[PDB]
Design an enzyme around this catalytic site. Structure first.
Site, PDB file in Angstrom:
ATOM      1  N   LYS A  34       0.832  -1.195   0.000  1.00 25.91           N
ATOM      2  CA  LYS A  34       0.000   0.000   0.000  1.00 25.91           C
ATOM      3  C   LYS A  34       0.862   1.239   0.000  1.00 25.91           C
ATOM      4  O   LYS A  34       1.821   1.339   0.750  1.00 25.91           O
ATOM      5  CB  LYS A  34      -0.963   0.017   1.199  1.00 25.91           C
ATOM      6  CG  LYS A  34      -1.885   1.228   1.212  1.00 25.91           C
ATOM      7  CD  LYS A  34      -3.070   1.017   2.156  1.00 25.91           C
ATOM      8  CE  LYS A  34      -2.683   1.352   3.581  1.00 25.91           C
ATOM      9  NZ  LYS A  34      -3.722   0.899   4.549  1.00 25.91           N
TER      10      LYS A  34
ATOM     11  N   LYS B 132       0.623   5.588   0.153  1.00 25.09           N
ATOM     12  CA  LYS B 132      -0.259   6.683   0.510  1.00 25.09           C
ATOM     13  C   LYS B 132      -0.125   7.728  -0.543  1.00 25.09           C
ATOM     14  O   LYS B 132       0.994   8.080  -0.921  1.00 25.09           O
ATOM     15  CB  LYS B 132       0.054   7.236   1.906  1.00 25.09           C
ATOM     16  CG  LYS B 132      -0.292   6.220   2.983  1.00 25.09           C
ATOM     17  CD  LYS B 132      -0.158   6.742   4.400  1.00 25.09           C
ATOM     18  CE  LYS B 132      -0.282   5.597   5.394  1.00 25.09           C
ATOM     19  NZ  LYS B 132      -1.310   4.595   4.998  1.00 25.09           N
TER      20      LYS B 132
ATOM     21  N   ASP C  67      -4.086   4.866  -0.477  1.00 24.36           N
ATOM     22  CA  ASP C  67      -4.700   5.489   0.676  1.00 24.36           C
ATOM     23  C   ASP C  67      -4.626   6.999   0.547  1.00 24.36           C
ATOM     24  O   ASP C  67      -3.532   7.571   0.491  1.00 24.36           O
ATOM     25  CB  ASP C  67      -3.931   5.060   1.907  1.00 24.36           C
ATOM     26  CG  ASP C  67      -4.642   5.405   3.196  1.00 24.36           C
ATOM     27  OD1 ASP C  67      -4.213   4.844   4.204  1.00 24.36           O
ATOM     28  OD2 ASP C  67      -5.595   6.225   3.209  1.00 24.36           O
TER      29      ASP C  67
ATOM     30  N   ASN D  58      -5.899   9.055   2.884  1.00 23.19           N
ATOM     31  CA  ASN D  58      -5.922   9.600   4.245  1.00 23.19           C
ATOM     32  C   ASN D  58      -6.829  10.815   4.418  1.00 23.19           C
ATOM     33  O   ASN D  58      -6.418  11.820   4.991  1.00 23.19           O
ATOM     34  CB  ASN D  58      -4.509   9.931   4.726  1.00 23.19           C
ATOM     35  CG  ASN D  58      -3.694   8.697   4.986  1.00 23.19           C
ATOM     36  OD1 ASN D  58      -2.915   8.244   4.120  1.00 23.19           O
ATOM     37  ND2 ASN D  58      -3.893   8.108   6.159  1.00 23.19           N
TER      38      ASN D  58
ATOM     39  N   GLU E 298      -8.604   3.860  -0.367  1.00 22.26           N
ATOM     40  CA  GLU E 298      -8.813   3.947   1.079  1.00 22.26           C
ATOM     41  C   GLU E 298      -9.020   5.381   1.618  1.00 22.26           C
ATOM     42  O   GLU E 298      -8.299   6.307   1.251  1.00 22.26           O
ATOM     43  CB  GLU E 298      -7.647   3.271   1.811  1.00 22.26           C
ATOM     44  CG  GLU E 298      -7.778   3.200   3.329  1.00 22.26           C
ATOM     45  CD  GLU E 298      -6.588   2.481   3.954  1.00 22.26           C
ATOM     46  OE1 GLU E 298      -6.151   2.901   5.064  1.00 22.26           O
ATOM     47  OE2 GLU E 298      -6.063   1.522   3.318  1.00 22.26           O
TER      48      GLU E 298
ATOM     49  N   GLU F 122     -10.419   2.291   9.617  1.00 19.99           N
ATOM     50  CA  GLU F 122      -9.350   2.401  10.607  1.00 19.99           C
ATOM     51  C   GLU F 122      -9.723   3.440  11.676  1.00 19.99           C
ATOM     52  O   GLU F 122      -9.207   3.408  12.795  1.00 19.99           O
ATOM     53  CB  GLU F 122      -8.018   2.765   9.943  1.00 19.99           C
ATOM     54  CG  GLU F 122      -7.929   4.201   9.479  1.00 19.99           C
ATOM     55  CD  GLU F 122      -6.706   4.445   8.617  1.00 19.99           C
ATOM     56  OE1 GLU F 122      -6.548   3.761   7.571  1.00 19.99           O
ATOM     57  OE2 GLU F 122      -5.913   5.338   8.996  1.00 19.99           O
TER      58      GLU F 122
ATOM     59  N   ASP G 167      -9.449  -1.039  13.104  1.00 22.54           N
ATOM     60  CA  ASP G 167      -8.200  -0.910  13.835  1.00 22.54           C
ATOM     61  C   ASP G 167      -8.415  -1.597  15.193  1.00 22.54           C
ATOM     62  O   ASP G 167      -9.330  -1.213  15.950  1.00 22.54           O
ATOM     63  CB  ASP G 167      -7.918   0.589  13.992  1.00 22.54           C
ATOM     64  CG  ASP G 167      -6.747   0.889  14.925  1.00 22.54           C
ATOM     65  OD1 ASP G 167      -6.906   0.780  16.156  1.00 22.54           O
ATOM     66  OD2 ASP G 167      -5.672   1.265  14.417  1.00 22.54           O
TER      67      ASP G 167
ATOM     68  N   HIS H  24      -6.036  -2.963  10.495  1.00 20.38           N
ATOM     69  CA  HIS H  24      -5.277  -1.715  10.419  1.00 20.38           C
ATOM     70  C   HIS H  24      -4.323  -1.687  11.569  1.00 20.38           C
ATOM     71  O   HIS H  24      -4.750  -1.698  12.742  1.00 20.38           O
ATOM     72  CB  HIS H  24      -6.194  -0.499  10.463  1.00 20.38           C
ATOM     73  CG  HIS H  24      -5.449   0.815  10.524  1.00 20.38           C
ATOM     74  ND1 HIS H  24      -5.375   1.560  11.652  1.00 20.38           N
ATOM     75  CD2 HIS H  24      -4.737   1.505   9.556  1.00 20.38           C
ATOM     76  CE1 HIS H  24      -4.665   2.666  11.409  1.00 20.38           C
ATOM     77  NE2 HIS H  24      -4.263   2.631  10.132  1.00 20.38           N
TER      78      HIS H  24
ATOM     79  N   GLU I 263      -2.608  -5.773   7.460  1.00 21.25           N
ATOM     80  CA  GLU I 263      -1.705  -4.669   7.163  1.00 21.25           C
ATOM     81  C   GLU I 263      -0.387  -4.870   7.886  1.00 21.25           C
ATOM     82  O   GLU I 263      -0.352  -4.981   9.114  1.00 21.25           O
ATOM     83  CB  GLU I 263      -2.282  -3.322   7.606  1.00 21.25           C
ATOM     84  CG  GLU I 263      -1.280  -2.202   7.370  1.00 21.25           C
ATOM     85  CD  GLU I 263      -1.750  -0.825   7.803  1.00 21.25           C
ATOM     86  OE1 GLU I 263      -2.499  -0.729   8.810  1.00 21.25           O
ATOM     87  OE2 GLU I 263      -1.365   0.163   7.132  1.00 21.25           O
TER      88      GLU I 263
HETATM   89  O1  LIG Z   1      -3.758   5.665   7.215  1.00 19.71           O
HETATM   90  C1  LIG Z   1      -2.943   4.903   7.704  1.00 19.71           C
HETATM   91  N1  LIG Z   1      -2.826   3.543   7.454  1.00 19.71           N
HETATM   92  O2  LIG Z   1      -3.473   2.652   6.683  1.00 19.71           O
HETATM   93  C2  LIG Z   1      -1.874   5.288   8.700  1.00 19.71           C
HETATM   94  C3  LIG Z   1      -1.837   6.594   9.203  1.00 19.71           C
HETATM   95  C4  LIG Z   1      -0.852   6.958  10.124  1.00 19.71           C
HETATM   96  C5  LIG Z   1       0.096   6.044  10.549  1.00 19.71           C
HETATM   97  C6  LIG Z   1       0.061   4.748  10.051  1.00 19.71           C
HETATM   98  C7  LIG Z   1      -0.916   4.377   9.134  1.00 19.71           C
HETATM   99 MG   LIG Z   2      -5.082   4.292   6.119  1.00 19.18          MG
END
Ligand SMILES: O=C(NO)c1ccccc1
Ligand SMILES: [Mg+2]
Ligand SMILES: O=C(NO)c1ccccc1
Ligand SMILES: O=C(NO)c1ccccc1
Ligand SMILES: O=C(NO)c1ccccc1
Ligand SMILES: O=C(NO)c1ccccc1
Ligand SMILES: [Mg+2]
Ligand SMILES: [Mg+2]
Ligand SMILES: [Mg+2]
Ligand SMILES: [Mg+2]
EC number: 5.1.2.2
Lengths: 357, 357, 357, 357, 357
Positions: free
Chosen positions: C162, C164, C193, C195, C219, C245, C268, C295, C315
């Site tokens: 994955k 980001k 992702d 976020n 995501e 998450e 999570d 998560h 994950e």
């Molecule tokens: O969005 C996240 N993970 O899928 C994330 C965000 C901060 C730290 C670790 C992971």
């Molecule tokens: Mg995430």
């Protein structure tokens, strides 16, 4: 160009004349975090947070103190500040204690901003001060004390009281509500609060019986987050279901109102996100046709309600009376905004020292 | 205790360099009502209204002058004033020209309140001034002129333009958008506006063709009040449907958003109810997850967008430049709020005489 | 009759080899609370919490230490303990940091209960250990580093990674995904992702572009609490929207799934309410027909996924490797549960001293 | 081939025997715009507009006078005329005063068209004249006057009266409604009108009490535009909720009826869009199974109801009696259409001069 | 690593003191399949199945015996076992007798697993044993016997009884329910069970009459599979509709609850899928805000309810009393879990021989 130059917090645990008994436990003292937001204009914004339980008190203060690093040196611009805090806590979860801490900052920042302009908060929000009807908010007191407090409230000029119910038996709820009715007469509001203590079918059963007694509203009959359950209870009632004190941000209010959870709302100035969140909440309540009351924080709520298009009741529960000057007054049961800049909170500095944790 | 002491209006019909051609007719001149709100603090609030057609112009000014008696001697509290007007007009219909008139009063009152506190409107609202991205808003200009205006706008640092479409043939819409695209390149926004000119099926067909071309949004494809029809159009599109300039009050916006009429919103500072309506509007766009732009009224919209949680674009269409000092400026395509109290509107008193109706 | 006899917490801020860059900010270190739950059977349960930002770290540990009194001398019965905590915190708000704290206690209690019966957690839950497919979870790393990490992960036997995304430009998102794809080949999962970084329209536009590229899932494209907005995004996509998450308790998951927010879920272990919340969560994902991944919290998630009817991916993001013995291993990209009682968490007591806050 | 050749308007302010007291304010006089539409057939169409408040009177006349330019020299074809006006006001907002002005034109054009054909309007619409039951419409009068007016109405042959309610206390609403019942007996309709004065929960509470008294309907319990709120009130009632007087065009009626706002409708011949809008409204009311009454404009409404498939009641409130000949008569409480071309409006030219503004 | 090493079944037909008369037929004896699941740990898991009618008894035993081939030599891991059985019966239909057989295995496997760990089942599920209120469950007995059994149950300490109704006449249902009320007094639950015997309108009619008598709930008013019909009945009741005993797997419960079929649930430990299905059902009941009771299987249900977040009532109907030791006891009408490993079922080996088929 006016900047935040400091944040000071003080944890206090204030004994109450009347412990707030609920169906889910007693709040015997008020654990508060008192907040002072220093500015480059020299004026200091004041607010406070209610921690509910002492178990959460030191954690909330610590959280605020660590949050100071993100606000000191930022412009005193509560709306911009709120957006920055939402962003910073995007990942951790902008809810719960974090959201409550952000709201305490916001309320202090608006107080400071009222002070910068030498104007009562209500006027800064663009509204006139008006008297706002208040109910005297009692607790799970039993027939003797509920009767005595109801008589006192009526003598003080209040036109409504709230009692907390959820005794083991429905007949006990009814007994307290009827005893209150005897003390206050027929032209008088009796609100009732279950504090989340019932399941949906128990709430429907108890609520229909209470509705026959003529109560003014039924507040948090079931688990606060269960909006669908509230709706289910509301669907079986003529009397309105009341909730909102536990909405963390206007986004939680939006979800509740979108599915018809309740016919009244009462956001908590802290949980809803302070002044910034409250003004957003009032815009929602207006569009959804929901009369909007306050929950606690009577000092700031008297300002906020005057700016609220569907303003309903102010909850009079004086949690901070021991540490705040009584500049907010009550005439014929109506809260009267003091003619002071910002919120009109002035610390009782000698009193605070007695309650420090 | 600042009171309103007087209201003066002036109706003007101002020539535009570029007549606003739309698929449903041309706005060749700008019929404006210029509003002065006098106060007991010696400051004067300014705002203006757009009447769209000179046919509505005298009626709008007459309405305002007849409203003078109901606001003179009222406190300068725009929120309380707006509630009083909603109530006074609830029988007649608090919509259309009456609502527009109430909004003009609201924008002058907030301008005035800003002047009372010697602070830009944006800061009075609790936000920081920030540059706001703006698109240069053009019209049904034909291929040659549309392409020229787009190049010119690009040269001035605008990162997007809007063109009005709805030519007799879909081929013509496409030829205009294509010629703009070739001249401004791939990394540049082209918004399009149908000005309510299509029925739902024609809108689906034309909009799907434009979406293949790459447009930034599709604006008012059908009759403005037809929220369900907009929803049907949106359901057939990936590109966002844009609307809102015709919403009269946040209650119309609430209905449109409640049924999914559009994925973008652009309230008009006048029609939405001035600053008071705008702020309520921004609360709604935030909860519904709708990026919110402005429609006209660029001088006040720069302030308002700065305080808008989902702020998207400012529309640059300078309807009032002939009678208002150019204190609002654009740097790299972004509107820059002037450092002046209230809105930063200053009348060009020499020029107004030329255009009085 | 095994009782809890004590609670000890240690706050650490652990350096990461690769800072977790996201579109909304960087998690450069791991702020963790390490939890020890002592019992009258002589075994000690271990778990940890992730505070996301050091700003929340001391507050979270303080909250836990203040909660020690309410759990000491309670039976080691994690389900009954969770109901007691829900009730104690129902006024304060059983969400956010409070809910996270309750979850850390829950995960230590189940670890402890596993140790009481000398059995891995997975078997205590009534399931068999099985290898669980894992993706190697990276960050907003830029083209060069993302491609390197992907190759490295491929070399180690991971079948997916994955990354980001949410760079300033959509072109940048695509350039990163394309460079990963060229380096790992067609038969390999690339999850992405956002976020929470996009509004709904931008998410639709960016997501439809990524779907053309072939990504495994998209995501948190928008604000996490905006379930309706996620639903709107999902409705425009074939590729699955992934979230969860940020769900605090199975009640948030229930609301998101009830309105079709996503086609995949990834609770999570901490935010969902520990093992107790996870098991409730897995019941929901099963009925709603939602493949369920984890998560973070890889050590306990390997156990939990093994007992999850719609188990999808684990994950792999080793936040706690600096303070926890590497008893969890990966064979051919699959997490392998260690043959140890409870969770298989063993503190690296030599290393913890280095990172104490 | 018959063309419109002139438009003349006259603003009059007519004192009323019985001022129309409402819960939201008193209408002490009737501000009307009397309309004369000259034609090339020589006949002159007559209608009038009700401005509600004098504040709106001069603005509405001015608006009409400026609108003359778009209708003079157009064919006398009310349906084609309405479509052209809708188009011309597409941008400005075809609602409020603009829509009301368009409706006054439409009503005069249909009167003229009845005159061209030397036939009562009802016959031109393809229906027979029939007697239409009418209720005598009173106001917020208090017990003494409500009782006296109720007795008079019963003596005149009316079989129903309407009173306006929304006193500060529910017991006051009930007192007036019960006193009326004593004056008229049990075989007699009592309609009640809240004039938008209540919030949803107050409306549910007051309405259920009124329902126990046996009232005929409950009219505009809450804000007129709040259709969802009406629906919510209706959901709790057996008695029908009545509304419609404030629908601006059949498009507003359509939205109200689509979500079940009410079980009765009563469009206002002016607000609904004149004859053209009314005929469209009647088609909607028929499909939605809604008995349709009239609001004011008794002269034209007696024609329109006779052409209305779900025709219910005619509101007898004689706002224009001082300036219009009493050609409309009442036999056994039923309105009897006079045998005159068009609407049967004949000006009292001597009387008009007394009331000119 | 603990493996299943045998399955033995015994078909028994046990005469009952009080035949279970229902509106759809009499259950004169209890046809049970007693199950022993041998393990490599040496302990033997015990459960039983209720076949309802002797007609189904030999078929169910045969089915189980043939199913032995798929479970012997599998690990004793009830959750993994359930997933394998779901898969194996994917095509044939994982419902009805097949699902019931799978549940009997699951219940025996969890009993065995409690024995492996030398712990009561409730503790293995992570909960504390608590007393669980039980109602004494009677049948379609007529006034004489219903009265006599109601008196006995009250003497035994039960605080509620259930009777089965659906006599040819409603007056007969009412007569039995009222006679019971005389026997038990006003502070006492009377549940009533229709056993699917009514059509929707008959159920609405009979239920509203029963609701006037103050019954505790109305159970399976109509055909068990007709969830929409249940919802329709529920929509007309304040008293809760109860159902769930006939849900085959949590997937059937999910469908029922998704459309609001009922306000209470009572899964049957066998039909719901044993312990594994029950825990999933409890997660659903919690999210949907549904108080969850048990149906039959009092031995295991006393454990399961203690682990159930919305636990409501235990049904006391002792079908297996003749062949199982009375280790489950009742104190003040509450079921008390015996302090024994697993479920606490011990066969009465001498008694079983009398009832073998
Ligand atoms: O969005 C996240 N993970 O899928 C994330 C965000 C901060 C730290 C670790 C992971
Ligand atoms: Mg995430
Ligand atoms: O529910 C409440 N108030 O309305 C409440 C709860 C705790 C303390 C004070 C008040
Ligand atoms: O549709 C419009 N703008 O976005 C518009 C219409 C008329 C005049 C100016 C602008
Ligand atoms: O609401 C009304 N009528 O039904 C009304 C309002 C004002 C004047 C006359 C009538
Ligand atoms: O419906 C029933 N019980 O609740 C039932 C049916 C048959 C046998 C025993 C009980
Ligand atoms: Mg409360
Ligand atoms: Mg436009
Ligand atoms: Mg009316
Ligand atoms: Mg049953």
């Amino acid at each position: 160009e006016v900047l935040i130059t400091g944040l000071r917090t003080r944890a206090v645990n204030v004994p109450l004349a009347y412990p707030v008994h609920t169906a889910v436990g007693t709040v015997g003292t008020a654990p508060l975090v008192l907040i002072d937001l220093a500015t480059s204009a020299g004026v200091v914004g004041h607010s406070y947070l209610f921690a509910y339980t002492p178990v959460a008190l030191k954690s909330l203060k610590q959280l605020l103190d660590d949050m100071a690093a993100m606000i000191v040196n930022e412009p005193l611009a509560p709306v911009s500040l709120e957006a920055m805090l939402a962003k910073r806590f995007c990942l951790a979860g902008y809810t719960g204690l974090i959201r409550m801490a952000a709201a305490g900052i916001d309320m202090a920042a608006w107080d400071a901003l009222g002070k910068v302009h030498e104007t009562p908060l209500v006027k800064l929000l663009g509204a006139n001060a008006r008297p706002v009807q208040a109910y005297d908010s009692h607790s799970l007191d039993g027939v003797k004390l509920a009767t005595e407090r109801a008589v006192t409230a009526a003598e003080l000029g209040f036109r409504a009281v709230k009692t907390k119910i959820g005794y083991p038996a429905l007949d006990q709820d009814l007994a307290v509500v009827r005893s209150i009715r005897q003390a206050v007469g027929d032209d008088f509001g009796i609100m009732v609060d279950y504090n989340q203590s019932l399941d949906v079918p128990a709430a429907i059963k108890r609520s229909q019986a209470l509705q026959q007694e003529g109560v003014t509203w039924i507040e948090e009959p079931t688990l606060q987050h269960d909006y669908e359950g509230h709706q289910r209870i509301q669907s079986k009632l003529n009397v309105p279901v009341q909730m909102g004190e536990n909405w963390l941000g206007p986004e939680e209010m939006f979800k509740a109102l979108s599915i018809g959870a309740c016919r009244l709302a009462m956001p908590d100035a802290m949980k809803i996100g302070g002044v910034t969140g409250w003004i957003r909440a009032s815009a929602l309540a207006q569009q959804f046709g929901i009369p909007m009351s306050s929950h606690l924080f009577q000092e700031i709520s008297a300002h906020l309600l005057a700016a609220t298009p569907t303003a309903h009741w102010l909850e009079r529960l004086d949690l901070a009376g021991s540490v705040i000057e009584p500049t907010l007054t009550f005439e014929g049961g109506n809260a009267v905004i003091p003619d002071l800049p910002g919120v009109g909170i002035i610390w009782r500095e000698k009193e605070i020292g007695k309650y420090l944790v």
